[PDB]
Design an enzyme around this catalytic site. Structure first.
Site, PDB file in Angstrom:
ATOM      1  N   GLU A  11       0.807  -1.221   0.000  1.00 20.14           N
ATOM      2  CA  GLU A  11       0.000   0.000   0.000  1.00 20.14           C
ATOM      3  C   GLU A  11       0.843   1.276   0.000  1.00 20.14           C
ATOM      4  O   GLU A  11       0.367   2.331  -0.426  1.00 20.14           O
ATOM      5  CB  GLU A  11      -0.987  -0.004   1.191  1.00 20.14           C
ATOM      6  CG  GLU A  11      -2.062  -1.097   1.154  1.00 20.14           C
ATOM      7  CD  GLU A  11      -3.037  -0.965  -0.035  1.00 20.14           C
ATOM      8  OE1 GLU A  11      -2.994   0.075  -0.769  1.00 20.14           O
ATOM      9  OE2 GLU A  11      -3.857  -1.890  -0.230  1.00 20.14           O
ATOM     10  N   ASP A  20      -5.994   6.422  -5.184  1.00 20.05           N
ATOM     11  CA  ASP A  20      -5.546   5.039  -5.248  1.00 20.05           C
ATOM     12  C   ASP A  20      -5.535   4.517  -6.701  1.00 20.05           C
ATOM     13  O   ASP A  20      -5.748   5.293  -7.646  1.00 20.05           O
ATOM     14  CB  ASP A  20      -6.358   4.125  -4.308  1.00 20.05           C
ATOM     15  CG  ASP A  20      -7.816   3.868  -4.773  1.00 20.05           C
ATOM     16  OD1 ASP A  20      -8.226   4.226  -5.893  1.00 20.05           O
ATOM     17  OD2 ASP A  20      -8.587   3.272  -3.979  1.00 20.05           O
ATOM     18  N   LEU A  32      -8.732   4.070   2.320  1.00 21.79           N
ATOM     19  CA  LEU A  32      -9.722   4.620   1.393  1.00 21.79           C
ATOM     20  C   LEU A  32     -10.613   5.616   2.132  1.00 21.79           C
ATOM     21  O   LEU A  32     -11.209   5.288   3.184  1.00 21.79           O
ATOM     22  CB  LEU A  32     -10.560   3.495   0.761  1.00 21.79           C
ATOM     23  CG  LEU A  32     -11.725   4.005  -0.097  1.00 21.79           C
ATOM     24  CD1 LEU A  32     -11.154   4.727  -1.332  1.00 21.79           C
ATOM     25  CD2 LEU A  32     -12.669   2.881  -0.479  1.00 21.79           C
ATOM     26  N   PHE A 104      -8.547  -6.301   2.724  1.00 20.88           N
ATOM     27  CA  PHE A 104      -8.049  -4.916   2.836  1.00 20.88           C
ATOM     28  C   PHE A 104      -8.204  -4.174   1.500  1.00 20.88           C
ATOM     29  O   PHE A 104      -8.714  -3.026   1.447  1.00 20.88           O
ATOM     30  CB  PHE A 104      -6.587  -4.903   3.309  1.00 20.88           C
ATOM     31  CG  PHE A 104      -6.090  -3.540   3.739  1.00 20.88           C
ATOM     32  CD1 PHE A 104      -5.606  -2.623   2.800  1.00 20.88           C
ATOM     33  CD2 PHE A 104      -6.098  -3.176   5.090  1.00 20.88           C
ATOM     34  CE1 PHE A 104      -5.159  -1.349   3.210  1.00 20.88           C
ATOM     35  CE2 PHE A 104      -5.640  -1.925   5.510  1.00 20.88           C
ATOM     36  CZ  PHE A 104      -5.177  -1.006   4.570  1.00 20.88           C
ATOM     37  N   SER A 117     -12.200 -20.080  -5.993  1.00 19.08           N
ATOM     38  CA  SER A 117     -10.890 -19.963  -5.349  1.00 19.08           C
ATOM     39  C   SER A 117     -10.964 -20.295  -3.852  1.00 19.08           C
ATOM     40  O   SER A 117     -10.090 -21.009  -3.343  1.00 19.08           O
ATOM     41  CB  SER A 117     -10.276 -18.563  -5.527  1.00 19.08           C
ATOM     42  OG  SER A 117      -9.712 -18.411  -6.833  1.00 19.08           O
ATOM     43  N   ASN A 132      -6.699 -20.111 -10.421  1.00 17.41           N
ATOM     44  CA  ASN A 132      -8.035 -19.540 -10.432  1.00 17.41           C
ATOM     45  C   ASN A 132      -8.025 -18.067  -9.987  1.00 17.41           C
ATOM     46  O   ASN A 132      -8.724 -17.221 -10.560  1.00 17.41           O
ATOM     47  CB  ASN A 132      -8.975 -20.361  -9.558  1.00 17.41           C
ATOM     48  CG  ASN A 132     -10.401 -19.939  -9.716  1.00 17.41           C
ATOM     49  OD1 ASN A 132     -10.922 -19.137  -8.933  1.00 17.41           O
ATOM     50  ND2 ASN A 132     -11.034 -20.419 -10.780  1.00 17.41           N
TER      51      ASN A 132
HETATM   52 CL1  LIG Z   1     -10.220 -16.742  -2.510  1.00 20.19          CL
HETATM   53  C1  LIG Z   1      -9.062 -15.457  -2.065  1.00 20.19           C
HETATM   54  C2  LIG Z   1      -9.366 -14.914  -0.651  1.00 20.19           C
HETATM   55  O1  LIG Z   1      -9.180 -15.996   0.336  1.00 20.19           O
HETATM   56  C3  LIG Z   1      -9.713 -15.722   1.570  1.00 20.19           C
HETATM   57  C4  LIG Z   1      -9.810 -16.765   2.504  1.00 20.19           C
HETATM   58  C5  LIG Z   1     -10.342 -16.495   3.768  1.00 20.19           C
HETATM   59  C6  LIG Z   1     -10.794 -15.220   4.113  1.00 20.19           C
HETATM   60  C7  LIG Z   1     -10.704 -14.179   3.190  1.00 20.19           C
HETATM   61  C8  LIG Z   1     -10.162 -14.443   1.925  1.00 20.19           C
END
Ligand SMILES: ClCCOc1ccccc1
EC number: 3.2.1.17
Length: 162
Positions: A11, A20, A32, A104, A117, A132
């Site tokens: 950041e 940003d 932000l 974040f 994902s 992915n």
């Molecule tokens: Cl699938 C990319 C984010 O992965 C996360 C996994 C757990 C909590 C927040 C995000």
């Protein structure tokens, strides 16, 4: 390395209001302020955040204070989210940092829609997850940052940040 040092790298630190990567008014360590195109609106949000009339400039201590709050809030958001919490709980501490990093950056609603994902991460199919993750607006708009975060999810190491 830890989530604070990680997000500090991703950041940066700027003590005056800036835009940003999406063109939104921001200050400090990626705090932000508003999605409004009004600089006055941003200055109002800043003043409300810091508790004084700043006229668009803050100190490093103030920046770090907002940053700590923002990290805390991202974590607390994850734990209150029914889709995110079980995945987060399933991860080791290094991959937890990668999860926090994404929340974040894009907000918990945004990352909660990374359904496929999230499932690969829960399943610990790290290479599949990494493939992915890259198939996203996120990766295409901030590829260098996304690549660091993805490497962290893929490896469970801080290699992308040393
Ligand atoms: Cl699938 C990319 C984010 O992965 C996360 C996994 C757990 C909590 C927040 C995000």
């Amino acid at each position: 390395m830890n989530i604070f040092e990680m997000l500090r790298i991703d950041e940066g630190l700027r003590l005056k209001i800036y835009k940003d990567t999406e063109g939104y008014y921001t200050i400090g360590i990626g705090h932000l302020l508003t999605k409004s195109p009004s600089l006055n609106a941003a200055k109002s949000e800043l003043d409300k955040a810091i508790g004084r009339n700043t006229n668009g400039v803050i100190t490093k201590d103030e920046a770090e204070k907002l940053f700590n709050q923002d990290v805390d809030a991202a974590v607390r958001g994850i734990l209150r989210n029914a889709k995110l919490k079980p995945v987060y709980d399933s991860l080791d501490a290094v991959r937890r940092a990668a999860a926090i990093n994404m929340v974040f950056q894009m907000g918990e609603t945004g990352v909660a829609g990374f359904t496929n994902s999230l499932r690969m991460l829960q399943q610990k199919r790290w290479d599949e997850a990494a493939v992915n993750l890259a198939k996203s607006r996120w990766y295409n708009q901030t590829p260098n940052r996304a690549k660091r975060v993805i490497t962290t999810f893929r490896t469970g190491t801080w290699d992308a940040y040393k």
